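Handover notes (outgoing to incoming on-call)

Open items:
1. Variable Lymphocyte Receptor 2: sequence verified, structure written out, both below. Nothing else pending on this one.
2. Nothing else urgent.
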Amino acid sequence: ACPSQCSCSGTTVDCSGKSLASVPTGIPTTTQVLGLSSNQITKLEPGVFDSLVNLQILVLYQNQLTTLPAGVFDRLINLKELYFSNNQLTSLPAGVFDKLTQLTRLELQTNQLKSIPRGAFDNLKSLTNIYLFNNPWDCECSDILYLKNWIVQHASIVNPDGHGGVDNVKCSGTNTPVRAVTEASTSPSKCP
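Variable Lymphocyte Receptor 2 structure tokens:
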């Protein structure tokens, strides 16, 4: 059955724009597309998505999330697209994307991210487009070096489709490109 606060169309569950603070309980396990955008979600509980083994698209755009619980996406082995822009994310858990081998699209723009955990994208061997602009990347901290190395390596897939490319991943304050950060200019002690 469709959750009372959402609208359902086939295997798509549209819970967007309903002033929700919580993900509904009892989303059908056959769901392939889950829209949660434009709500009031500030915190996801551990395991909130574990049932959604058939999910291919997850939309969390325009909420107020600041962190994620460890393992939150681990059961989403069929995910192809993750739309997580326009939240307030300040960090990502280690390993958070490790199970998303089919992911082609990852949207992280317009958050509060300072760095990406080392190796976070290691298993994303289908990824064709990632968005990272409009985050206050902390280029004084040595934690930035993985992101720098990864965007330099994979420059063609960063911020495509008119979003400024690899150069639009910018250091907070100085506004210089993250891709130009040198190891010697960073410090492990200048890390919040």
